[PDB]
Amino acid sequence: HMDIRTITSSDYEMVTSVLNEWWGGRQLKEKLPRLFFEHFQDTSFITSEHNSMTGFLIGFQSQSDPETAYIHFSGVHPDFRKMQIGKQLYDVFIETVKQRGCTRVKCVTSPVNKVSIAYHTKLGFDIEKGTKTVNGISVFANYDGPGQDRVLFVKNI
Amino acid sequence: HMDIRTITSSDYEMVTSVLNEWWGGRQLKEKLPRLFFEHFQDTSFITSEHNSMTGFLIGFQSQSDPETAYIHFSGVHPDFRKMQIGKQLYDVFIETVKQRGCTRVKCVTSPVNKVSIAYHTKLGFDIEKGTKTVNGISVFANYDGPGQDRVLFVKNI
Incomplete structure (x- = not known):
């Protein structure tokens, strides 16, 4: 069960x-x-x-x-x-x-984590517009510290 | 100013x-x-x-x-x-x-962090009863993981 x-x-x-x-x-x-x-x-x-x-x-x-x-x-x-x-x-x-x-849910991951980017996209999450682009994905530069760029997900619920 | x-x-x-x-x-x-x-x-x-x-x-x-x-x-x-x-x-x-x-406030620190224990005690915090004792202070064993004992502070407000 x-x-x-x-x-x-x-x-x-x-x-x-x-x-x-x-x-x-x-x-x-x-x-x-x-x-x-x-x-x-x-x-x-x-x-x-x-x-x-x-x-x-x-x-x-x-x-x-x-x-x-x-x-x-x-x-x-x-x-x-x-x-x-x-x-x-x-x-x-x-x-x-x-x-x-x-009314919305958010989370984050690294730009190189294709597994997570795929997972969240499949679940219907959009990505928030940051300041740079990495491999075609909008990213928030040094979001979690120097060299720690992050992809920010958001989904309306 | x-x-x-x-x-x-x-x-x-x-x-x-x-x-x-x-x-x-x-x-x-x-x-x-x-x-x-x-x-x-x-x-x-x-x-x-x-x-x-x-x-x-x-x-x-x-x-x-x-x-x-x-x-x-x-x-x-x-x-x-x-x-x-x-x-x-x-x-x-x-x-x-x-x-x-x-109606109450809580926080934690390491039992060896005397600076923090002193500061919180001076502010009026009591310490919660844990599972063991370290340097005479009650502590919650492995609270934040193996080997990460913690002193739990609590104060009514």
Whole structure:
């Protein structure tokens, strides 16, 4: 079977462990502070099949721009199709934030992350117009610091 | 002169670069991604004198526990006393989150960060009871990951 539920503080260990197991054994720079598991639980989820986690999503509603929801981090188990599980997580997140007054969802990725650019485009996200172009995609120069250009996604919901 | 204002997305470069100077130590693990400057602006502040930043505070209202406000990061110019600039940043933050319905404020630090433990204690924060003790302070073991013990502060407002 399958189920999706909101996260709890006790899920920290389980989720952070896969950051070392789902990305081909390559250490990710970005980490996930405990604060997300404690303060943005109602808009963060874990999907599973027969009590075994298949994916997760961490997100929240913008506070200074309430009509906007933000997806910070998500991942899908290697043995599962990225689109199916990922789509389920994004769909439940979207329905949840719509009930909070959000009319659009945002997130970001690196200009060289074609996997993410493809994934978000397939899900219907547009890209915000930045200041430079990288491989034909509009980008926000040094968005996350020097040499850290970012592609900003946005989807009306 | 002097002023206190809410942060804007464009303050990202200034704050992150100055912060590095204030520390004056070896490379620190990135803890301030751009998302904080874009989505929690009404509860994040910058203090300055003669157009030069003297301090900043990044915080937000908990979403899954609305009566709780959380301070993620704050810093004060080394040439300035913490209980002067810092107290001001914390007081403006508290006044702001009380208007959002918050009745308590939380934050965290490492049990070996005596500067932070002293500062928060002086401001009136209590420490939450964790699972172990480090240097006589109650701590939450591996709160931010393996080996990342944390002291959890809390104060009613």
